[PDB]
Structures are given as C-alpha cells and as structure tokens.
C-alpha cells in the first residue's frame, strides 16, 4: 500500500481514524471499495473521486461531512453502494447524486436533514434503498420519492412528520420495507398507502395515533404490522379487511377501550394474539378463520362466556391467559393436545367439573387463583399426566384431590380457609414447594420440599407442651394450682361467721386463679390426648371453640387476679388510715372488677382470630400477632396497676391485726410481678428489632411462667398465715359437730 | 462594501443564483437568492444590512454591505443554477455551479 492507508490485496482499501483531511492521494488505479470513515474531512472538493473510476463500494460514516461538490460524485458510473451517516449535512445534495446513474443503496440518516429539495433523487434508476432515519425533516417529499420507482426498502423514522398527505407513496411500486416509527404521527390520510402493493411489512409505533387508520386495507400483501405504544381508543370491525396474508400484529402499550368481533377474523396466517385491558368489551372475538393461533391472551376485559368450539377449533393454540375477566363457568378443553399453559386467574369461576380439563396431553402450568371455586371433582387432574404447577389459592375449598396429582413440582393452596383436611405426602411423591393455609398441614410433609407457612415452634409438629421436664412442671403447676386453691376456698367458705375486707378479697384472687389451674389443666390433658400426633389436632383446636374457651378462661383469670390483688391494697390503704361500712362498698368494687375481667376476656372474642395464633390460645404469639393494639393495651394496663399498688404499698412504708397480712399482700403482689413484669416485657420483645429470642424460649418460658402466680398465692397463704391456720381449726370443728 | 461576482457562461438570472458564505470548518450558508422577477431573499441575520443586486444584460452580480463587524470574516461564493428551478433556494443543495469566491476580512 503506497498510502499510509492500509489496503487489501483485492484492491480494496480500508481506512479509519487515519484523521486525513482530504482525499487519499497515490492510491490505485483502480479500486473495487473504498472505506473512509471516523475521518475529519468535511468538505469535498472538484474531482476528488474522479481518481477511481472502477469504484463500487464506497463509505463516509460519521466523517463530518458538509459540503459535498456537485462534481465531486461524478464519474463514478460503476459506484454500488454509498453511505453517508451520522455528518453535518443538512440536505440531501441533489446535484452530487445525480452525477451518478448506477449506485442501488445509499443512506443519509443518523445526520439532521431539514428539508428535501424537489428533484433531487432524479436520475437514480437503480436505487433499491434508502436511510433517512433519525433526521428532522417533519414531511414526507412526495415528488423527490415518486422520482424513482425501483426502491425497495426505505426508512423515515426518529424524525418530525406529523401527517402523510394523499398518495404520498403512490409511484413506490417495488418497495418491500417501509419504516415510520418514533414519529409525531397523529392524523393519518385514507389514501395515502395506495399503491404500495408489494409492501410486506409496516411500522407505526410510538407515533400519536388517536384513531385507527383506515388506509392499510389499500396495500394487500402486508405480513408485519406493528402500532404499538400509539393512543389507539378502539379498533373497527373489518380493521384487516384488506390484509389476509397478514401474519404479526403489534398492538400491545395501546390504552384500548373496544374492539369489535370482526376485528381479527378470517387472518389465517395469524399466530399469537394479546389483547390487555379492552374493558368495553364484553364477548369473545369471533375468531373463525384465525386457525394458526398458537398464543391467545384476553386480560382486562369483561367477558363472560368461552366458546365451546375455541379449542378444538385452534387446534395449535399451545397458551390460553384468560384472567381479569369474570367467567362463570368453563368449556371442554378436550379436543386440543398442543396446549401447554392455562392461565385463568382473578374469575368468578365457582367449580371445576370432572371433565373440563380431561384430554390435555400437553398441559403443564395450570392457574386457577383469586376465583370463587368451592369443589372441585376428585377425577379432575386424572387425565392430564405432565403438569408441574398447580395453582388454586385465595378459593373457597373444603377439600381437594389427588389424582394425577403426583408429578406436579409445585402446589400453591393459602387463602383456603375452610381447608381443613390433611395433605398425604405419598400421593405427591415429587413436589420441591409447597403452599398449604395452615402450618398443621405442611406438618406432614418433612432435595428437599420447601413450605411456605413455617413450623416455627409456635406450631408444633409433634409435641404440644414440648420437652418432657416442661410437660412435667406444667403438670405440677395444675395440679398443686388446682388443690391449694380448691382448699383455700372451701376454707373461706366455711369459716364464714364475720367476714372482713382483706379475708374476702384473698378468697376472692384465691377463686380467680382456680380458672387459671384450669386453663392449665386443659392444656395439660390436650397435650396427653394427643401425644406426637398435634398435627392433626392443631387444625381443630385452633379453628374451633375450644381455643376461645381456653384464652378466655387465661385472659379472665390474669385479669380478675390483677384487679382484685389492686382492691385488696386499696382495702389495706384504706384500713391502715382508720361502723366504716366500706366492706359493701368493697363488695361491689370486687363485683366491678370480675365485671371487667369478663369484659376483657371476652374482647377478643369478637375480633378476628385474637384466639387462633397459638394453640396455647394466648394473645401473646410469635412475632407478629392478629391484633397489635389489644396484646399492647393488655400489658400497659397491667403493668400500670402494679405501678399504682406499688406506690400506694410505698405510701404505707413510708407512713409506717391490721399490720398483719400487709406482709402476706405484699408479697402476693411481689411474686405477682417477679412472674408477669418478666414475661410482659419479653412479650414485648419481639416487637423490638433490636432483642432476638428463640421460638422455643418464648413457648416455654410463656407456658411455665403464665400459671405460676396461680400455684403460688395459695401455698404462700396456706403455709404463713396464722388466720388461715385458726380458720383450718374452724373447719375442723365444724367437720367434727 | 462592494463586491462582484462575474458568469463566465450566459446570464442565469432567470434561474436561482446567489452568495453563500463560508467559515472554517463548519457548512456553507447563503445568505443571497435571486429568482424570477428578481425576487430576492435573504436568511435571518442578512435584512437590511446584507443585499443583493441583479441584472441580466452586464452578466454579473453585485452584494452591498454596510457598517462592518470583524464578526462577519468570511471566504464568500456566488453560485448558480440553469436546469429544473424546482423552488427559491438557500441551502447549497440546489446549486450546480460554483465559483472561485474571494475572502473577507
């Protein structure tokens, strides 16, 4: 190569960011292609390619050219190819062109273009395309483009053309391609596109389309269509009347309101339809003709009713999406083998017979979700063998069946809350995930098979009290519970001649915590009864009364305890400071107290599932909880009575028969707290980001801890109380008279 | 200022003919157009200040300035055009001849 330019041995010549200014100069004689681009030429002067009159092939990309000489392109009578990109040229050069008659490609695009000169294109016989994209222009030249009939493929897009006149296109006979996108396109002429009846594909998208334009029909031979992302509001019947062989159809990003039946029949060639959001329709398609379907979505709409001919009519139809819409029931899928995904979500289906999916050999992803489905056949997935995905979540199941149901990898079924039965894991022998409404039901399942609502000891799978020496101090906490306290109050009872005040209110909290022992004892003879087998007792205990009858029976026993322990230091206040007659007054305070410990027991009752968190039936679970504001309200309040009587037995400190039994009642308050302030504050825990306990540590700390006030007050009147010693001497005289 | 620019071929009044001006290293503007019935037309920063003169039987072409701004240094060309007066030109497109020109400072 003379040229400091590189050049191939076929006498072609390669050159780029060689930075020359001008032409190449000592180059060959002759030269079949020439490549000078990246350059900083910009101008081109006389002649400059008349040095090479056997060029053919010849590129100026993004060279920066402005000027090019009229004579400059002359003689260039075996030229084949020019390109021109990405320059500062602002018009097509209409002389420079014409010095040439041989040339069949030529691009200009990518380079801002404002206006085309009239006869410019004259001359050129053999062009066959032609790049104006990405320029400015903001009309289509009707006169420049009718200059040459033998173009192929052309492209106006990325510019400024707001409307096509009338036989705009008229003389382009052979054109193939036409490009018209990312244009200001709004009004479109009905006699624009005549005469371009070789045309096969067109682009209208991101344009302003605010109709549907009615000039396609005139090209017949169209394949590809593409009006995407345009304010296209409604589509006509017969929209495609004119293009039959048509077979790609772009229409999705269109806010789209109406579409008529006849819009899409009769398109033979036609092989995937998506219609999103075409709220003002409320019929299927009319689709005959349309045989070659092979994806079919309908989302949005307000259909009601599936032709009953649909699948056995597009019998390679392989995806159906028909969700959004409100269909009542389903047809016969059977007389379609090809069809692998059903997709039919967000209905108003209310039941799935036995023979609506029988006959798809195919089928592999079924969705049946967010629908109104109460029963479904116990033959209904018998038939088809291959499917992965099952999803029938958010219905109204009472049971569901297993049949044909083993292969699948994936089963979803949450929401269905009046699905209480249990899942057999050998009917699914593959699943890799699974969804069930309840913890109890995945109990039973456990590479590995992964289940979305855990088992995280709050829902125990074996076990309901949990480890042995927790059963066993459980169970001695209700015992010794259930006899002390049965013991105290047949003392009060019947030791009864005069009965003050303080004696009252103890045989009182000593009544109140008897339901605490018997909270215990249910919980112990539950777990007794089923024994390694909680997980299918769990599903009845928490969905049923016997859960609101135990947390009742806790919160009223917690409750009434509190408050008769705040009146019994009242009561103590209230003697110390001293016929007074506030015993009856007293009596009525009680009266209040188990008044509103009924109250409080008894909220939860008619809240949603306060009860059903834990099968303890406290309403103190696991991280988050059914109702934040109660579990909060309960302990504040609590905890602001021990405040209270805790600075009123300060206020008795402080001014110091009836100083006996003030030690007896302040240490029922202070084992009181030692046992409730404790497990307040740590049922607060988990509220706090900040704290981490184990689930195993709550339930048992919770568990050992909720009844222990109860065991205790009895056993420490019991053993240090001189009253009750003189009233146990009472009732043995009795007994003996 | 005055300055002239002489045809070498017969008169091309009755087709588009004007001045363009260059500067370095960016595109050729017009700033000049001559048409039938001497119709003249100027671009947006040319009224007034910059005119043009015509006429068919003397064959050449006159551009008059007035009160000069170093700004306007510029390497100026007439041009003409013969065949298919398609429309009034000022853009270098429509142009087919071109002359020497002459710089100005």
């Avoid at chain 1, 092979?294 to 995806?319: A, D, F, V």
């Avoid at chain 1, 050998?426 to 992964?450: E, G, M, T």
Wanted: hydrophobic share 45%; with cysteine.
């Amino acid at each position: 190569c003379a040229a400091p330019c590189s050049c191939d041995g076929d006498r072609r010549v390669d050159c780029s960011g060689k930075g020359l200014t001008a032409v190449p100069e000592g180059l060959s004689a002759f030269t079949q292609a020439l490549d000078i681009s990246m350059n900083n030429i910009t101008q081109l002067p006389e002649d400059a390619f008349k040095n090479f009159p056997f060029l053919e092939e010849l590129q100026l990309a993004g060279n920066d050219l402005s000027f090019i000489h009229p004579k400059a392109l002359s003689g260039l009578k075996e030229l084949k190819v020019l390109t021109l990109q990405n320059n500062q040229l602002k018009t097509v050069p209409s002389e420079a062109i014409r010095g040439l008659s041989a040339l069949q490609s030529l691009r200009l695009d990518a380079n801002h273009i404002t206006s085309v000169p009239e006869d410019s294109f004259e001359g050129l016989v053999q062009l066959r395309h032609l790049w104006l994209d990405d320029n400015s222009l903001t009309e289509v030249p009707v006169h420049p483009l009718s200059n040459l009939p033998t173009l192929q493929a052309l492209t106006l897009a990325l510019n400024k053309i707001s409307s096509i006149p009338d036989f705009a296109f008229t003389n382009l006979s052979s054109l193939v391609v036409l490009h018209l996108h990312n244009n200001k396109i709004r009004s479109l002429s009905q006699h624009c596109f005549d005469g371009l009846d070789n045309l096969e594909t067109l682009d209208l998208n991101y344009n302003n389309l605010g109709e549907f334009p009615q000039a396609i029909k005139a090209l017949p031979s169209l394949k590809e269509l593409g009006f995407h992302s345009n304010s296209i509001s409604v589509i006509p019947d017969g929209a495609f009347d004119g293009n039959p062989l048509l077979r790609t159809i772009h229409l999705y990003d269109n806010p789209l309101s109406f579409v008529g039946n006849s819009a899409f029949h009769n398109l033979s060639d036609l092989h995937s339809l998506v219609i999103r959001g075409a709220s003002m329709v409320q019929q299927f398609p009319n689709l005959t003709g349309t045989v070659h379907l092979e994806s079919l979505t309908l989302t949005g709409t307000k259909i009601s009713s599936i032709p009953n001919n649909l699948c056995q009519e597009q019998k390679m139809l392989r995806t159906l999406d028909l969700s959004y819409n409100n269909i009542r029931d389903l047809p016969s899928f059977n007389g379609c083998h090809a069809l692998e995904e059903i997709s039919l979500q967000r209905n108003q289906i209310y039941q799935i017979k036995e023979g609506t999916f029988q006959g798809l050999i195919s089928l592999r992803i079924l969705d049946l979700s967010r629908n109104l489905i109460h029963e479904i056949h116990s033959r209904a997935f018998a038939t088809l063998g291959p499917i992965t995905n099952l999803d029938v979540s958010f219905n109204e199941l009472t049971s569901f069946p297993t049949e044909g149901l083993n292969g699948l990898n994936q089963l979803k079924l949450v929401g269905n809350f009046k699905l209480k039965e249990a899942l057999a894991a050998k009917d699914f022998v593959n699943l890799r995930s699974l969804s069930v409404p309840y913890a109890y039901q995945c109990c039973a399942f456990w590479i590995i098979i992964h289940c979305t609502p855990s088992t995280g000891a709050f829902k125990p799978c074996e076990y309901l009290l949990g480890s042995w020496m927790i059963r066993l101090t459980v169970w001695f906490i209700f015992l010794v519970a259930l006899f002390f306290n049965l013991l105290v109050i047949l003392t009060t009872f019947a030791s009864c001649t005069s009965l003050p005040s303080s004696k009252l209110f103890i045989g009182l909290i000593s009544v109140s915590n008897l339901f605490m022992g018997i909270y215990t004892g249910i919980l112990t003879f539950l777990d007794a009864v089923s024994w390694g087998r909680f997980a299918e007792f769990g599903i009845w205990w928490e969905t049923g009364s016997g859960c609101k009858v135990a947390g009742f029976l806790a919160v009223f026993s917690s409750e009434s305890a509190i408050f008769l322990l705040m009146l019994a230091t009242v009561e103590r206040s209230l003697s110390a400071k001293d016929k007074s007659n506030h015993l009856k007054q007293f009596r009525v305070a009680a009266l209040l107290a188990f008044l509103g410990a009924t109250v409080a027991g008894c909220f939860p009752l008619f809240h949603r599932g306060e009860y059903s968190a834990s099968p303890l039936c406290l309403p103190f679970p696991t991280g988050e909880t059914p109702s934040l504001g109660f579990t909060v309200t309960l302990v504040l309040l609590n905890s602001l009575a021990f405040l209270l009587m805790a600075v009123i037995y300060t206020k008795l400190y402080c001014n110091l028969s009836q100083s006996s039994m003030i030690k007896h009642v302040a240490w029922l308050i202070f084992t009181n707290c030692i046992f409730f302030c404790p497990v307040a504050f740590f049922s607060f825990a988990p509220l706090i980001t900040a704290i981490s306990i184990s689930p195993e540590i709550m339930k048992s700390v919770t568990l050992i801890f909720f009844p222990l006030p109860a065991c205790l007050n009895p056993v420490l009147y019991v053993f240090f109380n001189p009253k009750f010693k003189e009233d146990w001497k009472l009732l043995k005289r009795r007994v003996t008279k | 200022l005055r300055l002239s620019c002489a045809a070498s071929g017969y008169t091309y009044s009755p087709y588009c003919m004007g001045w363009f001006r260059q500067a370095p290293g960016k595109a050729r503007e017009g700033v000049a157009t001559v048409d039938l019935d001497g119709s003249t037309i100027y671009a947006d920063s040319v009224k007034g200040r910059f005119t043009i003169s015509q006429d068919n039987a003397k064959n050449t072409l006159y551009l008059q300035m007035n009160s000069l701004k170093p700004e306007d240094t510029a390497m100026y060309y007439c041009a003409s055009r013969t065949r298919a007066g398609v429309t009034c030109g000022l853009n270098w497109a429509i142009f087919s001849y071109w002359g020497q020109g002459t710089q100005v400072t």
